[PDB]
Amino acid sequence: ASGAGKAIGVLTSGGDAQGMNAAVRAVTRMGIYVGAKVFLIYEGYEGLVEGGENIKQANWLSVSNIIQLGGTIIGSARCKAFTTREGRRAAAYNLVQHGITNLCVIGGDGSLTGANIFRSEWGSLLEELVAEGKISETTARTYSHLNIAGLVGSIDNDFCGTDMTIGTDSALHRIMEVIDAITTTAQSHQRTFVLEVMGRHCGYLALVSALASGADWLFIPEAPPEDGWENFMCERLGETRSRGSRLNIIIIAEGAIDRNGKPISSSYVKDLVVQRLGFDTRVTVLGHVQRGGTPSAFDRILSSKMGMEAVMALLEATPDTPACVVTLSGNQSVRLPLMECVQMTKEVQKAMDDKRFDEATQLRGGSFENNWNIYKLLAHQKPPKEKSNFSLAILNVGAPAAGMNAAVRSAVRTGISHGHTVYVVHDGFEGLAKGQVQEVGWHDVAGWLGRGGSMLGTKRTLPKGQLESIVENIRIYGIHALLVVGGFEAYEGVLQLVEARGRYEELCIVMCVIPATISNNVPGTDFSLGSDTAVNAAMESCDRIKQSASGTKRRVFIVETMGGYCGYLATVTGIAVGADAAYVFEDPFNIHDLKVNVEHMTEKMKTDIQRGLVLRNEKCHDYYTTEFLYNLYSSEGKGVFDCRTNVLGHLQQGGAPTPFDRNYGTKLGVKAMLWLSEKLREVYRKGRVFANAPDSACVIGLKKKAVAFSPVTELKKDTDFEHRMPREQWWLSLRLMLKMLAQYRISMAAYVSGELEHVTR
Amino acid sequence: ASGAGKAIGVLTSGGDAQGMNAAVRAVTRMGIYVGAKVFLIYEGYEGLVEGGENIKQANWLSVSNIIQLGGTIIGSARCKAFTTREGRRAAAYNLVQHGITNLCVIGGDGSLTGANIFRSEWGSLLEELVAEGKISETTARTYSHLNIAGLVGSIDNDFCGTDMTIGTDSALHRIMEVIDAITTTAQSHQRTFVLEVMGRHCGYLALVSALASGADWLFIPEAPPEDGWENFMCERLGETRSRGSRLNIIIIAEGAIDRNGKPISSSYVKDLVVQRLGFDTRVTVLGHVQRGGTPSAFDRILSSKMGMEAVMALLEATPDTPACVVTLSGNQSVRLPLMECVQMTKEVQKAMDDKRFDEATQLRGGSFENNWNIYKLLAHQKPPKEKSNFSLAILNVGAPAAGMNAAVRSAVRTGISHGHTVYVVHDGFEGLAKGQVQEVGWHDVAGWLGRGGSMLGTKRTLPKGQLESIVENIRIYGIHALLVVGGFEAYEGVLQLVEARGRYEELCIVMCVIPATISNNVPGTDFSLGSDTAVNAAMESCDRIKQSASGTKRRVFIVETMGGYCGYLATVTGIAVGADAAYVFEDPFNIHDLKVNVEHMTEKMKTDIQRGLVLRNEKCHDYYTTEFLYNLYSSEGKGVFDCRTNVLGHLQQGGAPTPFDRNYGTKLGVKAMLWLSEKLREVYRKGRVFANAPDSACVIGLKKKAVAFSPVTELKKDTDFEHRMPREQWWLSLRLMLKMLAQYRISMAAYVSGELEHVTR
Ligand SMILES: Nc1ncnc2c1ncn2[C@@H]1O[C@H](COP(=O)(O)OP(=O)(O)OP(=O)(O)O)[C@@H](O)[C@H]1O
Ligand SMILES: Nc1ncnc2c1ncn2[C@@H]1O[C@H](COP(=O)(O)OP(=O)(O)OP(=O)(O)O)[C@@H](O)[C@H]1O
Ligand SMILES: Nc1ncnc2c1ncn2[C@@H]1O[C@H](COP(=O)(O)OP(=O)(O)OP(=O)(O)O)[C@@H](O)[C@H]1O
Ligand SMILES: Nc1ncnc2c1ncn2[C@@H]1O[C@H](COP(=O)(O)OP(=O)(O)OP(=O)(O)O)[C@@H](O)[C@H]1O
Ligand SMILES: Nc1ncnc2c1ncn2[C@@H]1O[C@H](COP(=O)(O)OP(=O)(O)OP(=O)(O)O)[C@@H](O)[C@H]1O
Ligand SMILES: Nc1ncnc2c1ncn2[C@@H]1O[C@H](COP(=O)(O)OP(=O)(O)OP(=O)(O)O)[C@@H](O)[C@H]1O
Ligand SMILES: O=P(O)(O)OC[C@H]1O[C@](O)(COP(=O)(O)O)[C@@H](O)[C@@H]1O
Ligand SMILES: O=P(O)(O)OC[C@H]1O[C@](O)(COP(=O)(O)O)[C@@H](O)[C@@H]1O
Numbered sequence A, B: 001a002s003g004a005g006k007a008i009g010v011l012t013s014g015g016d017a018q019g020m021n022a023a024v025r026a027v028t029r030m031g032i033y034v035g036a037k038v039f040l041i042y043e044g045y046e047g048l049v050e051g052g053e054n055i056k057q058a059n060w061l062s063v064s065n066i067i068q069l070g071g072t073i074i075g076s077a078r079c080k081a082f083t084t085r086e087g088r089r090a091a092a093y094n095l096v097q098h099g100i101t102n103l104c105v106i107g108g109d110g111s112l113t114g115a116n117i118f119r120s121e122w123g124s125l126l127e128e129l130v131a132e133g134k135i136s137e138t139t140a141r142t143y144s145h146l147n148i149a150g151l152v153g154s155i156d157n158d159f160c161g162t163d164m165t166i167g168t169d170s171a172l173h174r175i176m177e178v179i180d181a182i183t184t185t186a187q188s189h190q191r192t193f194v195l196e197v198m199g200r201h202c203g204y205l206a207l208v209s210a211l212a213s214g215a216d217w218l219f220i221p222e223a224p225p226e227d228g229w230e231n232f233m234c235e236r237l238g239e240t241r242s243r244g245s246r247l248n249i250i251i252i253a254e255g256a257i258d259r260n261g262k263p264i265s266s267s268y269v270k271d272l273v274v275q276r277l278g279f280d281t282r283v284t285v286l287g288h289v290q291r292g293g294t295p296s297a298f299d300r301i302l303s304s305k306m307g308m309e310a311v312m313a314l315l316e317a318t319p320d321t322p323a324c325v326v327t328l329s330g331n332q333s334v335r336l337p338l339m340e341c342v343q344m345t346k347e348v349q350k351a352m353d354d355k356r357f358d359e360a361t362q363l364r365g366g367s368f369e370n371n372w373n374i375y376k377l378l379a380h381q382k383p384p385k386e387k388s389n390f391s392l393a394i395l396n397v398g399a400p401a402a403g404m405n406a407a408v409r410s411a412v413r414t415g416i417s418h419g420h421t422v423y424v425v426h427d428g429f430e431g432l433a434k435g436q437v438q439e440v441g442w443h444d445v446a447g448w449l450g451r452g453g454s455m456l457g458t459k460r461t462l463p464k465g466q467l468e469s470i471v472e473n474i475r476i477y478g479i480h481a482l483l484v485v486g487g488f489e490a491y492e493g494v495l496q497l498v499e500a501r502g503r504y505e506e507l508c509i510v511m512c513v514i515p516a517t518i519s520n521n522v523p524g525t526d527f528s529l530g531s532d533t534a535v536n537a538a539m540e541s542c543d544r545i546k547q548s549a550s551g552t553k554r555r556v557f558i559v560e561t562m563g564g565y566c567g568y569l570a571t572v573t574g575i576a577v578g579a580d581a582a583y584v585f586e587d588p589f590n591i592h593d594l595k596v597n598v599e600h601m602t603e604k605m606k607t608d609i610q611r612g613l614v615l616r617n618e619k620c621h622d623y624y625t626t627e628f629l630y631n632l633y634s635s636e637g638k639g640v641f642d643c644r645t646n647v648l649g650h651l652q653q654g655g656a657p658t659p660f661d662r663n664y665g666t667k668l669g670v671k672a673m674l675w676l677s678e679k680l681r682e683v684y685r686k687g688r689v690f691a692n693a694p695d696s697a698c699v700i701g702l703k704k705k706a707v708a709f710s711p712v713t714e715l716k717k718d719t720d721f722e723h724r725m726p727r728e729q730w731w732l733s734l735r736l737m738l739k740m741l742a743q744y745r746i747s748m749a750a751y752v753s754g755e756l757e758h759v760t761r
């Protein structure tokens, strides 16, 4: 099973997408964990060509304390030598000199295209190399096959076969840190903010930035504006002024063009807005800033996961299996053949060159086209000449979670677009009982994307106590559907209404639960809305705490995270920060395990690493509290390290939503409203709505691959109501990666890696 | 004493510098605290002209929960009506209709110039107004004098009479957040980062940004580059590459010009660097981002202080005293006549128009010229053909503090420039005893500006125990001077060496202490290096914590801050975050005071404001701990609010230095090295250095107005060694502002406001 006797090469090439260091760290540590030799190839294909000093064998400490670093410690370089066979043969030679039959390439589309051509010629290169006399025929029959596992490291997301790339989330963090600087101030003058984003051929970042910020207009190469857009944009900005909206946001990709080949410059859009509107218009150009900063939490977790999965795919690969790209479609890890992804990239590039240009946007991926349609739908109120008798109420239940507001905004716009009469109830089920129901319009949710917490009130109170009041208010307001955005209490309350349908006819209404909570403890989904924001805040605190020793003193920090009995937040945060241990309820630990971990920390702390970090979930243990662990670690670490403690309380809660949470809540709010409309039309009979089947009350998912709708009655089997979490959680396999990255020898036969999948046309 | 029966008008105009909301809040609350009526004038001189609805009387809650908001909730507008007498008369009319004889203007140079012309014509405007029949002669003899207290709110810092303006620090926070996105990554390619800042007429933001980031080159309008700078810059970037420095930073003001009137564009510098060097060059343009984001801690404290001082100056102003600008030169509050500051601004503008152009930079202020000389000195190693036998060792003692590295970098460069032999000792006095002395060069401190903590090691150990080892190593290495960068232990250790001079001849060496600590507990200074960083991180945590209640739940947060017995950090953090109370050791409190504050909180919490925040210094009380306050507030607040707790541990510690701390540490490190060189030449006699007088061992200050050098023996009188803090601390007057902004009726007769001062030529 172990990959002993074989060597893995890891290199980065192209623009240094942040999160590459996390991927390199996971590749290295998994490679030497499974017994393989790991060789770090510096400057990418440059150092592959020159080789020699640029190829160095890695140890465990070579990738220590880099997971929080942006860029790449390996370094990347553009080399033309790898384009030609003269340098590519030298690259194959240098791999043979170290016995590196296994290569991990972490780069963009050009990097992975070069890796594909390098595999395709590996036999021919070796043949010509032995023919020229630089390697004997023996020592060439071995190494006859080169194994390539590709990782897409780029902010562009230009590789068509793959849905998400390393650094996309963090590039968007940079973009939204800058846009939040504009939108979160008290707006004074009438002004226009034009953001030039650094996508010269792919407009994905411009699109998700526009969706996350609620941009007024978007220029992307995938969908150039129609003729006469000059007037249409200026008029849109004009009615934006008439609305009283003092700020306009224009997102313009570097690759922005018109229907012809002529590029549209940010300066042109500036001067255009200045001339026709007179708004205070300044262009913001991020430039190198997009590749800057720390990697986001998502980038660190996913880079770690894909780096580990890259190594494992590289060991289980026979001479016959093709070069693969390890990626995630949805939450599911998957391997795609390198050849097909390169072919799709060539097809979209040819289509974008005025071949199938109107039909190039679909080949970019269904997610791109759907994101652009959602963006345009939410951007401007088109006139809904259609109308329906249906009316729906939107709840916020539980604790506040970052991204509830984004979900409610999208649900409101989408429901109004479908002709529904949208209500919002303040304080959740409390307000529904008390009748705090307020009909809402398009602009009542204006600017709700970036606002953290809950504009509508949230309450944890379950509906069973005031069930008579809830049915009364549903009858009064004619509520035909119910959209509940919240945590475990949201699911539990909708479950209580479904179970009470037998008693009350009025509760036979379509229900939908959008899981929105810090803890990620809601059954039926993998990611509750706002868990990403909490993870990002928690790691940022842990990074700050871990930096406080500044390399001199050697110290261990016991950090306590929230999440109730759900350990998700602790474990992913531990992965993101390189925590030695994340103690959680789902993995019960006794004093024997604590002594093992403390001795493990002590041994590590005598080595070069000086900053230790163990996380503890707030409800992991009844007795071994944070104070207990502090006393334990400080006693047993006497004369080796000092111990400190930091209980992250509501530092993980009140932050504004991360760009993932904004886009995520945006999308599933739309999807919940689409599903609500379809179910309500499917259930409307005899002149009234009567939703009695279990399928009419679902939790909108995203459970493995795509969005799902799990009936609440069916999820009741897999729900631990005492602990307020599901019984089987997908993320417990990430504990093995967490422990492996911390030198814990754990037999991870239970980890499942994504298998080969062909591209979805 | 109180200003009852009189009305104060407050307005913002110009670009909405962040921190204006803090100034408006302090103006409003101080104005109605002292009994005066406060009127909020919306959109500035616009709403002054139209008046009517745009002038509204303020209550205490009108400026509630705005201190953390950037921009200005009052709103600002450019109006040409105030330029002409037709609209200026209407402005004077609208002030008379509300009886507003007192006006606070919070704006840039154009705003304050308009306010000056409005006062100068106030009598003529009133005369023409009564002549036209819109006000009777009675009701015009009253209001015959208009009182103007100006506040400089702008990112430009273009107002010549004033050293610091509201929003400069926060604009620099935005600039350095973008630069740190570049510099803190693992550098991979050779690349150039051209940052355009909006220095369209004033180049102050570009200069301090360049100094804080260590920019390779600077374009400011004040000092245009000499002819042929094209080659000189490109060569500088060339040797930067040859050094192995993979990143170049170019700071180009918007108003970058050459010695002629031709502007230098950021695109021109880009294409120039691309053509001659080929580095991956991208321009970053901040645009509106510079005015965005939250105000920094400094901006909130200083805006609050100057807003309060503006009101007080506005009440103690007789018909004879002129219009004043409330500003701070150094740490000292001061009032400057509006006319002289406007005159200086006109003189510098005329000088910059090719009149006295080479001599315009000095009239901008001595701080500008000194900052530019320090920048150029530290930027590039010029050849020091001078040499001296003197040799000095640089220590880091105590805890790590953000900005020690910046200080050591500047001390190293300045000492090498003066021909000294610079040593750095790792781990402070421990290393000096152990002989961990390493001679240092120019590039050994490369990139130390933005690095937090200490690159040299820090230890708290005092020198008395290993005094024999210290004198031995001073003798071995020939250490003629000693630069100690650290907290109270740094001062105490230098004091121990001075007291031991009588026993050991070798300890008769010049000593200098740079105060660098989170607590700001070092006698001889007002601001220890790195206290600003701790305050900023503390408020950012408190803002995050305060935002977590999400506008519906009534919750109080007990937030525990560090700082030892020194309460500075808690109190300024309370001012920055609008904390209800900051319990500190220097203000002893008993249970009676706690009941007063808790009842005060309960009454406040029944009103519109729902998020309370009390701060507690870690060592303020022996028994009334954070847990005690939690139990107290949660018990007495039962049925009104919930209570939560958050001990900010080392979250306040390990951050990168704020831009203030980088520039501050930079400047005082230069100044300490200048003073070291002068003292060593003044003390060199008989062929050796013999420093025995008390003046040869000083703490570099910045104590009220400018930098000072306090002998450690003299500071021993005003030092509480048991509590490790000075006995008389300048900042205890800020407690009264803290308590006043929280509705505590405290007789603040002990607060001293800056008096009138003429401009320093
Ligand atoms: N068709 C190709 N054949 C061989 N090598 C290639 C090919 N394309 C690119 N490469 C090699 O991969 C290296 C990096 O590729 P590229 O310039 O396109 O950046 P990238 O990998 O796509 O990353 P990013 O888009 O984020 O900037 C190139 O220096 C080149 O040596
Ligand atoms: N926020 C936006 N950003 C960019 N382009 C936009 C935005 N809104 C509308 N557009 C573009 O303006 C053009 C016309 O807009 P509009 O939607 O009103 O008419 P349409 O024929 O119905 O287009 P659509 O297919 O989207 O329904 C379209 O090409 C559309 O892509
Ligand atoms: N983080 C935030 N906190 C508080 N208020 C915010 C935040 N972000 C935006 N706003 C407010 O939302 C208001 C509405 O304008 P905004 O720019 O945000 O979007 P919009 O153009 O009005 O509509 P849309 O939601 O479709 O984008 C703004 O006046 C702004 O004050
Ligand atoms: N000489 C003047 N006389 C009368 N009013 C003036 C004069 N200069 C400016 N003002 C008024 O002050 C308002 C704002 O001034 P200005 O445009 O120069 O911005 P500012 O106050 O300097 O702030 P900032 O520089 O940061 O952008 C103007 O709209 C104008 O009405
Ligand atoms: N980091 C820098 N940024 C901007 N201009 C610079 C920088 N360094 C040098 N210069 C400018 O380049 C010109 C020549 O530089 P240099 O210092 O080497 O000669 P100099 O005659 O001795 O000038 P200086 O008065 O500063 O001593 C000067 O006008 C100087 O202002
Ligand atoms: N916050 C930081 N943490 C760690 N290393 C840093 C940080 N900032 C810069 N560096 C490192 O400092 C190194 C030196 O280059 P840098 O850009 O910072 O300045 P420099 O040009 O070399 O010299 P100078 O100090 O005069 O500006 C960089 O390689 C970078 O890795
Ligand atoms: O798990 P939930 O109930 O869905 O909400 C998460 C939040 O609630 C908490 O339990 C804490 O809430 P409280 O501070 O009000 O007690 C944390 O887990 C987290 O801050
Ligand atoms: O007051 P000092 O001694 O100068 O240093 C400040 C730091 O030391 C502290 O006392 C805490 O240090 P420790 O965590 O190591 O115990 C805090 O006041 C602060 O983090």
Ligand SMILES: [Mg+2]
Residues within 6 Å of the ligand: A014, A108, A109, A110, A154, A156, A158
């Ligand atoms: Mg690419």
Ligand SMILES: [Mg+2]
Residues within 6 Å of the ligand: B014, B108, B109, B110, B154, B156, B158
């Ligand atoms: Mg100005």
